Design an enzyme around this catalytic site. Sequence first.
Site: not given
Lengths: 196, 222, 243, 204, 233, 198, 244, 250, 244
Positions: G30-32, G75
Amino acid sequence: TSIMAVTFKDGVILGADSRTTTGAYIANRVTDKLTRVHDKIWCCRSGSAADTQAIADIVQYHLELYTSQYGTPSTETAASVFKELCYENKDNLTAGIIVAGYDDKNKGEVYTIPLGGSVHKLPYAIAGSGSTFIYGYCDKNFRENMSKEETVDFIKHSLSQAIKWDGSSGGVIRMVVLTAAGVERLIFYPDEYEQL
Amino acid sequence: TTIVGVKFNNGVVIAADTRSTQGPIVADKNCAKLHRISPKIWCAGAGTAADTEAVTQLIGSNIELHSLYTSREPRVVSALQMLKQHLFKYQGHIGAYLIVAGVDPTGSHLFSIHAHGSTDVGYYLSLGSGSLAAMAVLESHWKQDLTKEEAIKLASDAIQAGIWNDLGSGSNVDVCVMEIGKDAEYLRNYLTPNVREEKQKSYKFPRGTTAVLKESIVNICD
Amino acid sequence: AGYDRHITIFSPEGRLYQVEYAFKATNQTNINSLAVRGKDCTVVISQKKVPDKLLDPTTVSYIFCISRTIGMVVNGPIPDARNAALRAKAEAAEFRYKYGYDMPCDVLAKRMANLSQIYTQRAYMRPLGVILTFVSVDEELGPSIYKTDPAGYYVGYKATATGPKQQEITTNLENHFKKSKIDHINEESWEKVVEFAITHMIDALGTEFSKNDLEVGVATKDKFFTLSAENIEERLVAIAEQD
Amino acid sequence: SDPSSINGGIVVAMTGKDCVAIACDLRLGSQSLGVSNKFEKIFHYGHVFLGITGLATDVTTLNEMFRYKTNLYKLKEERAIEPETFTQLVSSSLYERRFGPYFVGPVVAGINSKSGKPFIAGFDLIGCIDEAKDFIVSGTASDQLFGMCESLYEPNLEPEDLFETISQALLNAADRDALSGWGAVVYIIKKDEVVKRYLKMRQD
Amino acid sequence: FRNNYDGDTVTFSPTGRLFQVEYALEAIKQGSVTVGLRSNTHAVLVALKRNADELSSYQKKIIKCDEHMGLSLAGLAPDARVLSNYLRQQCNYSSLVFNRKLAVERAGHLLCDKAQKNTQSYGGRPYGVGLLIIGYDKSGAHLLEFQPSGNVTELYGTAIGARSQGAKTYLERTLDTFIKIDGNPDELIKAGVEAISQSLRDESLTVDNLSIAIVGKDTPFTIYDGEAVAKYI
Amino acid sequence: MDIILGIRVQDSVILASSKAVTRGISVLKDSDDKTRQLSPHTLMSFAGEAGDTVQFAEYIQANIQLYSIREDYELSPQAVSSFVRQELAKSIRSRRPYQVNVLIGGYDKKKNKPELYQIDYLGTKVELPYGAHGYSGFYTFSLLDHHYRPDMTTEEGLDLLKLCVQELEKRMPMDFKGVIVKIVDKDGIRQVDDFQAQ
Amino acid sequence: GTGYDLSNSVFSPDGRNFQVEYAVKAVENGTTSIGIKCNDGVVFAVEKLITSKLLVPQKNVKIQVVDRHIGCVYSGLIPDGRHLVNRGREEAASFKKLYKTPIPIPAFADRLGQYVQAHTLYNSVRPFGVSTIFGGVDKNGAHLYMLEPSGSYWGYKGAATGKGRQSAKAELEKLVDHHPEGLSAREAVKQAAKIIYLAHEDNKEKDFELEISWCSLSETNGLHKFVKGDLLQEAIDFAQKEIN
Amino acid sequence: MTDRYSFSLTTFSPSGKLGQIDYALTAVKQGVTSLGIKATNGVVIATEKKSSSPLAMSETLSKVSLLTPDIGAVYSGMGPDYRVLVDKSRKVAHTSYKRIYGEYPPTKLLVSEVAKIMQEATQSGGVRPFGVSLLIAGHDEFNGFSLYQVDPSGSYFPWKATAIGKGSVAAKTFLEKRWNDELELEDAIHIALLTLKESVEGEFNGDTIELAIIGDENPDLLGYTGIPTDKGPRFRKLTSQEINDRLEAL
Amino acid sequence: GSRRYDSRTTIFSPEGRLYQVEYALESISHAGTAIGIMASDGIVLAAERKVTSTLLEQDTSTEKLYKLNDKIAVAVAGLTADAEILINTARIHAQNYLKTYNEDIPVEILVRRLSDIKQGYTQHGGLRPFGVSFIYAGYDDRYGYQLYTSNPSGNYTGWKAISVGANTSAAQTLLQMDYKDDMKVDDAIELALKTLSKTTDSSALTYDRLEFATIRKGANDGEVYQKIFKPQEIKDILVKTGIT
């Protein structure tokens, strides 16, 4: 029953008579109506003994479980749990509870919870059948930030009058002093307070 | 019914009369009103007789199972808590009024329980129709730091006040003594001051007095 | 030859592999604890390890205050540890409400061991990967140590130890109680019992400790509490002025 | 109004020397209307005897209940139910219906097969056990029965004499009650044998 | 890999994938194309309906949810019916209880959460459909993309179904033009039809082939079919 | 209320049941048959609350017929009466009880004996040589106490019912519109079709 | 043998739960996102990958509020995060209903913990595919927490998760060393923007949008509030100046 | 959540074997030895207290349990399974018997209730069988003294004497040599200690051995006086000291 | 989820057989043989205890012959614990019938009920079947003396003489050989013992390895009597028939 709780400079004091009747017969002349729900959160009980005993026990259970998880509860939180039980079961309860407590931040606090289950934060509170006779006396004599000795004298004079006129009140005047120093039990016998 | 409880310096005693009634009629002239919760926790009940007996055996049964589960002698506060929460649930419909007394590892105890689930604590208590007669004696002679012998005397005198003055009480005095160190001693018919006097006549009839129509042997075996 | 190792049913040898693998999980944290009884106190020591510098150290704990009187140290992963902690607290409070007195250490242990036995016999519940060591100063039994595991087994201890290097602590303590001939640490103050525990953990593990390398829980008459870093430091100063 | 008065009826039990008696009237009415003069209120399960006064439908239902329960008892225990134990079964069964009770006045009578000891007991409608050494009474002429038993009774009566006493207690009590009578039956019970006798009485 | 981890929605793959959700996503790709786009005054749905035979009708793909909200579907139509029904109820609940038209953003959150519950529990299955929700609420024109993974995204314009990438690249180029089409419904629909035609290949847009919907400032959600969309071919 | 009479003679049970159905100020029907055949040799008559009376009788009938098919066997009159009593006893402590009183006349083919059972709405069962429900008993019982004999023929039984019906027609306030009479014996159940002027 | 990684509640022979470890892979993918504890509050920030020009800027909000004083960011699988926050909100309401006081952050952290742990106990559910960073201000100060798919959670000085967690953690560790006496809310907001930008080198192939929220006693009155307008640009400008 | 295992985990294999019952019996085989011996005027049940550590207090774990005043139990196999069986056995003696009849159940019927519980864990959804064999010794008025074995299947059998667990084959053989129908209780205690000594490797004393009897009534253990019919429990656990007395003259 | 661990106890094989019923029947074929034989004036029930010991208390033991009613008994072959579950429900059913009709339950009605319970575990519920086969011996006033058998399928059948458990093929041949319709109980007693004596897997047929019962008219009464033979009585009848 005559009960009250009074905030003062160092904390709060709970006061009560010791008489419980079934009709005109005194079933108990040495009743203890000052009930601990936590170290420094206590309550005064009026109404059905069965109801108020059951309420206080459940509240004591909740605050024990609260403490285990989240640490020492505030006096407001205790008042909130009483209110929740009284309000949500108003059809099957006849309970009039005064909740009083001390913590270091807020000092002394008093919350009264009448029949309906409403909550009222007050500087002092009176309740029970005997309280009607001392509305005038208490309103003319209570002051904020009194000393321990002044507050003990105010409660003792107040309840002695409630006892004098109310048949449902009597016996000894119990008190419970709540401060930073800890918890102190006081008791005053008829021969002292009738003479006042 | 007259029941009392009296604390003394090393324990507690309870007592009761032995009259059981149905309205104004006496059913049992020697009913046993002192019940056992556990070996050293005893109970005296008033109100609806079936309810006092039922609730005392239920909590007695659960207290036994609790004692076995915890590997510990049962405590009086446990009997008290279980009784009151059961009674409170039923809103007084279980018409049990009890004086529960006993000893355990935490000391000696004396409590009263009412049908709606309220409880009291004291050094002397009384319940039943002879409550007021008995309480008058207790208020006249109780003192602090009683001996075992003084306590049995006081409690027994209190039951007599009920026996003689209350119509709902009578016959004999049962007692049970619970002392901190020792076994509980149940004193069935500790006093018998109401022995029926010898009748003036015998009403044993001459045989054949009763007319019979038909007679037969009943089969029990199979 | 496969699914008997996935749920809690008997293998042909009468074993429960999921129970045995849950014991394995108890060591995942690489932390050792021990417990000793005093004259009128009970002390638990557990290693505190904070690898990440981004952690708040004050939140890294495997000791729990179950009730006013009972304390519990867990060897195993923190999620399961807190699951056991929350349940034990709820159980402790319910006992007091229903039966009118504080739940004893041994009774709580039995209860939690019964719950664990259930996960060992019912398929849909997994065992918790934890060993729970309960401590108190019981009003009837005195200083008490009772330990439960993922098999639902429990017993009382004179002293005990748990973790990867359990055996080193255990034999060290065994050798002490053979010499002293008694089943507790003969010392009046709890502070010296804490010093004993830490001293014997140092000897057994062959490792020195700072104030942040240890967690300490103490049980006395009517209270269980945990020591602060500064309370521990005071304790570590005492042992150094004698070693 | 009162479910315990609609049908009428009485039962009485007495202990004697190595024996017990239990008797009942035969009336089954509906208010003033007498309906059956063959309504026996004594039943037995093995050697334990149970009388039941009160509402007749519950009399019948409880008889069938205890037959049902004593039959299972015998199959599991491999022995007949004893009077002491049956008394506890009756008690617990009644109390099970505490807030919807059977409107009845049961009476147990028997001799323990092991100890040979005569036993009787009575109950209220919710199972409170009246245990008495001398006599137990139940029904619409219970006042009358208490009066007759208290006057007529003495302890340690022989079977032949106990018969005369209990019969005359029941008869004279029944005749002072509108809703009782219309026949009577008396069981004299000993360790070995049990004799049943139908009594001649007023039919009004 | 894959083979062992795609039996049910409750199972993660070794790389953290949810294959049952991904297979449900594949049902949308096989579904017929539909486009959404908006300006600051209106929002438009355009859909390419699919038939079975020349004897069969064309499966309708647009569903009205409330007077100010509606959606188009690609994938399992029965699942769109269930989700549109839920949306109809939520819109309705807001009006009855709060006298408040449901925010299109809140409608997106509700769909997300309803789809998510099917991706974490045993026995169920993910929804096998994708949805484009348009609406006009108290903050203007809105277009949402719903995927059955639970992911919902607010966009200016988008497309889903087979060959939807063509329409999507067109809109991504046309962005600055169609967003400025304020107070002119016909011109927005033209831009939607030019986008949907980018995804064509098999056939041309016929009269009973095309379905269009529009909502905006003084325009209740309204569907156009048949001769009503003849002026856009 | 409705008239329900029963009489067991030597070889048969005879049931007599009034024909009137009255609601308020109007007699709605004067040919009502207040009876159901539960099995070829068992007949039940009924009286009580308006709807409950037929609903109960038909429900019992359905159950006994079900038993007969399952077991290919007719239950004894004693067994049927006990089943009926139990159903009534259940309902008395239920939410809305069946307010129905019944007589059950049966011929036990195993014993070759006729049998009559009176059961009220509480589940009060009793086996009698003759029976009535409601107020009708207040006239008939004493009449039958006098004239009844256990060895009577079916014909002597019918004469005895006539005497009961005449007494009711004389002294009862209600016009119950005569009775339908049925005989239960070893050959089953038949109706006496000419009792109106017998 | 094998097959230990097919069901959720199953222990492997080395005492592991492979289904939870696989859930971590979903988070790592996932995104940070990050959290920064300042001396009277907490700051949250997240990277929002702009897939296309068609995504409306500043909409699609990812940070969520619980009660009025707690912020949550996560995340991994976004829906699982929402599900968790919905539970958190139910849970915070319950606490307030009974105890009147707003739920303390430690109390709130355990509520999420116990719930997430429960989803590792049975094979009829799958673990949460998110790591959640959350916190706020209560009676006794600020608190920052990170909660993993196992249900494991601790208090943090700074926290990071997602694709660029190593970069973020490295920057977070430098701030802990170089600001031992404590960082301010104003500073932490700017510093959070920097870290998201430095962490974005892992997802440098595509464009992104910055989102920041904060809960501070002096700056927000102890309420959770989003960073918008001139303060958000000031933080973006600071990050762009620091990147070069 | 939800026990979705609503199907059996014990099923018949092609050969007719119920696998999990066999495997439970195998678990019992690995368990420490326990035994029971019935005399004319009592019953004795015994087992080894194998401590898991010298730091453990083996007094806090009792393998021999009171179920009713006149009934006791011991086992071989998995201890935690035993513990919960005891809890359930104690409770069922009240709910299914004492609360109905006002007296404690006879041995055979309490055994029957325990057996039923064990049978159900062999057929119910989502459970495994119990990994224990119980020996239950007891007294009641009409049946006298009795000893029963209960197995993971739920099957139970009455015994004059037997053993279960580790060295049960050898122990049974030894009991067949020494048992007769004229043994006094003290003779049975002696036979029990001799038999158990062959099973124990290490120390054999009152601290390592656990032993209880069902015998005479113990009025000193009742806790009260006044009721002639209540004469106290027949179950008594022997103390560490009482065992050592009989080992010095062994 | 759970699906993986479900044996599916209630499915057909491709041949149209119920796996678990067949495998339960296989289990019962290893159980001690039980025999029932009906005479004109009574019924005999004989059963072999498989696996015994010197220390097994026979006086108290009852593992094969159980009393359901004063007029009905059963002989068991299979899992004893399973049988006792079924025994107890059959006892309750007989009492319910008696309470309802004030007549003792006809034998077939009791057998049908119990066999319907077995059939249930075969068609729904996902549980293993009861591993039991019953021989029913009873009397009622409709059919007089009756013999029935039921197996785990829930199928039941009526017999003049029958065997269950081990070696039923051999036992049924021997019975079919020496049985005749005008037999007497005392002749049937002999037939049952002889038949067991030939089919036994043991060396000899001794008293300590048997259970024996008769349901006779009682010789002198007019009603039925159930006699369950005590060890000494079996030892006596074993000598009379000539097997000492």
